[PDB]
Design a protein around this ligand. Sequence first.
Ligand SMILES: O=C([O-])C(=O)[O-]
Ligand SMILES: O=C([O-])C(=O)[O-]
Ligand SMILES: [K+]
Ligand SMILES: [K+]
Ligand SMILES: [Mg+2]
Ligand SMILES: [Mg+2]
Lengths: 522, 518
Amino acid sequence: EAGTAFIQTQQLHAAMADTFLEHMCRLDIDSPPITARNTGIICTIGPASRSVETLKEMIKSGMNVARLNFSHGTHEYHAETIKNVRTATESFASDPILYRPVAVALDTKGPEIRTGLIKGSGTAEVELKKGATLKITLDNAYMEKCDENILWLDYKNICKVVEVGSKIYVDDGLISLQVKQKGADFLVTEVENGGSLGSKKGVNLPGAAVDLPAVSEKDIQDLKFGVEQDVDMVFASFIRKASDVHEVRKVLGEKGKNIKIISKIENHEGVRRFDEILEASDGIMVARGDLGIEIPAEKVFLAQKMMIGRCNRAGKPVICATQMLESMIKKPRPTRAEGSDVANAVLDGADCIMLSGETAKGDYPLEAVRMQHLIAREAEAAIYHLQLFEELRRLAPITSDPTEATAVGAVEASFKCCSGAIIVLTKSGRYAHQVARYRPRAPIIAVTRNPQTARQAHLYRGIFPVLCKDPVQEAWAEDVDLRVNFAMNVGKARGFFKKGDVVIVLTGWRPFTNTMRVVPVP
Amino acid sequence: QTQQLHAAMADTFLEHMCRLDIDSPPITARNTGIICTIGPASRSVETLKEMIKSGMNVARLNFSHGTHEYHAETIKNVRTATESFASDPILYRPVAVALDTKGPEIRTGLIKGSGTAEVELKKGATLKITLDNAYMEKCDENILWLDYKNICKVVEVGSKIYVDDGLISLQVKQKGADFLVTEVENGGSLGSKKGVNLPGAAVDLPAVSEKDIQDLKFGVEQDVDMVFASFIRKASDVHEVRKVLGEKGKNIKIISKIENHEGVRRFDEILEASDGIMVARGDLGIEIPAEKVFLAQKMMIGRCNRAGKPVICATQMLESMIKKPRPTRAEGSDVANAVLDGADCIMLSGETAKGDYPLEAVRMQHLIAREAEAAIYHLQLFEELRRLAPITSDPTEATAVGAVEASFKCCSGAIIVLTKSGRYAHQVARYRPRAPIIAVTRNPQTARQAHLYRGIFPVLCKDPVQEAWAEDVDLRVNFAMNVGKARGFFKKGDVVIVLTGWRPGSGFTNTMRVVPVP
Ligand SMILES: O=C([O-])C(=O)[O-]
Ligand SMILES: O=C([O-])C(=O)[O-]
Ligand SMILES: [K+]
Ligand SMILES: [K+]
Ligand SMILES: [Mg+2]
Ligand SMILES: [Mg+2]
């Protein structure tokens, strides 16, 4: 019983526009999105979020990957966080239809520069005033005696790499110092941007050639611990060149060879050497916190769109990270810039978006996860797939690989029939990755028996991993039918599609491979 | 290369993105207008001079607060600062004055002054909402007065009420003659005179209140350049504003602020009646779900671009810079994407009115906008603007498009256009050239109003009119040439596009010259 104007869901009116300009003009706040949310959500776990009961709610709210930030915390602290993540995750395991795999990511400390402790207890702060003099010292006598006159930091070669006139940034680049005088193991600086300085804050030296290793001896100890803890992926801080990626990957040994290596790009050299880093990496993080201090803040969006574009072109995962919902550390709703930032990261093409302080330390971790979920789903509907899919095809080589032809044919078919899902049977993830790179509108239900595959799948836009727990059937066709039926039940239970809807099914490895069928949901 | 020219030549949007280069420096010129709200942080003549130097094009006065005496002095200070640069007519920048109306705002009263200046509203606590003016200056955690006297008629039991940027939320539990009983849903600290939103209600406040009439008439008397009309819901609201401005104010530009669901739904009729649009995201993101604001923003920017009318992106673009000298990564991204979307202007509110770093916020909008302007994919944008434009044989329109295509062909340093009232320059700006549009006018109001359009760099010519029409045209063109050289837009060996009128007594701007600099 209509009346006047029935509004198409999923921005389908905008989807049909013949120009991008008209696509924008048709975006409709009254066009509700589909249930499925394709962009992966990565959450940094910390004091605000590491209890088992909070982690259960994080998972329910949409967290796909638990990020452990090894810039802070000792190994027993991280071991307990991982234990809690797994307790919370497996509390849902009794129902495989509804169980969500949750990945664990180790984010390295890497070649950070950090200050010491403010004198006293270390929890106080000192007010640095503009124009005042501040001495930076390497003398360890002051490593717990920092104040408004003398500042200790832990980079022993700093005096070599800076010069008179260079700028030094402290605490998220909020405090700035100008080097007036150099010394043996000290620098005399003048405070440019003042502010309140706490303990153990991050330091950046833009334009200085910092010579700390991408992977220090202590970083190796963290990586080995990560292998022992069976982490799914490493987010490697401050990657500057391809050989840095190899230092991360090779040291994990044979035991860690399946761990995904995500290079964090957060300095000027990583941007300049991006292509060789991307080639050596499994994926990329646009690590905007350090990046926006190392290069001018006004250039970060160029680097972000460049990297997301190149990762989309290569079919490798890319994460947009840092300060996406920053005000939600203290407030229950985001600023308008933060809502825009999350949406535009998805429209840019990010496979995943990330929360750091918002979930690690803030007062509203659940609300932050929920808001990334809501924004991502709205933005996914607004993507101009008509142009995106055409360009991804044109920028993708014609190869003789039959599996790539299957994947592009499946995504083409999914657009042609507006399918409710692409179901993919996958052991390693590869077949599902191949579909995701063409960025279908429809969700990808990736059925696997491999738990690590299920967890690592979250790196890719649109791959909804489901972990089949049933034994392998001796008859291959019976085993395929079992796994397809599992995916059909998942999609119906989660509201992705209904009986009678059309879906695409890719049946995976056969003892040709990955047959495609376009079927009504049984 | 420079100016993201390598990315500009990509054959796909995806490759365009892949080619964006942080080491490709932009041109000197910055095309996106910057609107700054003036308040205690920015009201002094000394600070305003630095704001102008830093890039402020439009001073916004917020009539939600203050007296007419206060705003008259703000306007006086803006003009003193602006005219302190007039001794150099080649470098002088016109600065516009914008009056932002209170409109059908709902606000709480003053917190009872004998206790803590803020009160703590705790989740689950009861809070009584009263309309009894006895409590207008006695608000606390027990009783909260607000100024919407008819609120009980438009809410029912179960309605939700949002306070202070929608950070505090209440749920109505009972009603009464002139009061409501609510329970705190999302608690927090409550200060004085905070904005209130009723997203589920049909608020029946007048589009133009008696106070708004007084303020708009004051704006006419003060010779403001534009009005930002709050909470515009429909075309008839725009008509009311235009009626108040009347004949004396007929040339004042009306920018309708879209900040509720109805304004979005009725956007096309509002746009038709308005001179331009503000995406007023503060209220909009409380009236509708926060996760839908980007859809409304890109819809309005797109349709304003399609219509050739100015659109402003506003509110919380650099919000953390109220307290910090550098923005968050989301804020830098937001400013860049507003420019990439197509916004003519970007705006600062608390960042310049009240914050500790007003000049840094202005400078950051300048820096980001200029970087984003180079990153626009002009190849697709210009093709789509041309394809969607109305069909016409008008010589001036054809000359404008020809000029923009010529400017791309030779990567020109500027398009110079002569205009009395603005339109000839507006017609070029709507095709969104990369090159700056140096618009020469003798009309000071046109020079100030031109800031509403992407890429129109107004220059106010103060020379007497020459006896010969052709000599007067040449004088104004030569003035633009010297401004562009002095500002670093171009130098000898560069090429500039020059648009001028047909002949004496014609209104056609139908003559295009491609001029080596020179
Ligand atoms: O390390 C990070 O995630 C960053 O700097 O954004
Ligand atoms: O009024 C405004 O500017 C807003 O609400 O964003
Ligand atoms: K780290
Ligand atoms: K106002
Ligand atoms: Mg970092
Ligand atoms: Mg408002």
